[PDB]
Amino acid sequence: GANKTVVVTTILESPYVMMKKNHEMLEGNERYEGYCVDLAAEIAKHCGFKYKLTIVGDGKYGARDADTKIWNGMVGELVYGKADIAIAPLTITLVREEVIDFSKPFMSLGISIMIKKGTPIESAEDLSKQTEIAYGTLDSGSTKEFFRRSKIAVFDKMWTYMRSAEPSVFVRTTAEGVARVRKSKGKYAYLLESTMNEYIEQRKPCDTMKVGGNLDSKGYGIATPKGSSLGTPVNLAVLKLSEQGVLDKLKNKWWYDKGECGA
Ligand X SMILES: CNCc1cn(CC(=O)Nc2sc3c(c2C(N)=O)CCCC3)nc1C(C)(C)C
Stretch that binds ligand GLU, among 136-144, 147-155, 158-166, 234-242 (CB under 6 A): 136-144
Is 119 one of the annotated binding-site residues?
no
- Amino acid type, 196: M
Q: How far is the CB of 27 from ligand X (least distance, A)?
A: 31
Nearer of residues 185 and 240 to its own copies, judged by Cβ:
240
DSSP states of 51-86: EEEEE-TT-----B-TTT--B-HHHHHHHTTS-SEE
Q: 34, 89, 136, 221: which one contacts ligand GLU (CB under 6 A)?
A: 89
- Which part of the chain contacts ligand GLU (CB under 6 A), choosing from 37-45, 50-58, 114-122, 137-145? 137-145
What's 31's DSSP letter?
A: G
Burial of residue 1, with CB atoms counted within 10 A of its CB: 0-12 exposed, 13-18 middle, 19 or more buried: exposed
Beta bridge partners of 112: 192
> Is position 91 annotated in a ligand binding site?
yes
Min dist. Cβ of residue 167 to ligand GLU (A):
20
Q: How many residues bind ligand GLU (CB under 6 A)?
A: 10
Residue ranges that bind ligand X, judged by CB under 6 A: 92, 104-108, 217-219, 239, 242, 247
Q: In this structure, are residues 100 and 225 in contact, taking their beta carbons and an 8 Å threshold? A: yes
Interatomic CA distance for residues 9 and 1, integer angstroms: 22
User: Running DSSP on this structure, what letter comes out for residue 22?
Assistant: T
Site for its own copies in 162-221 (CB under 8 A): 216-219
DSSP 91: B
Identity of the residue, 149 or 187, whose beta carbon is nearer to its own copies in the bound complex: 149
What whole-number distance in Å separates Cα of residue 21 and Cα of residue 30?
Answer: 11
143 marked as part of a ligand binding site = yes
3-state class (DSSP) for residue 209 = strand
Interacting residues toward ligand GLU by CB under 6 A: 61, 89-91, 138, 141-143, 192-193
Binding site for L-glutamate: residue ranges? 89, 91, 96, 142-143, 193
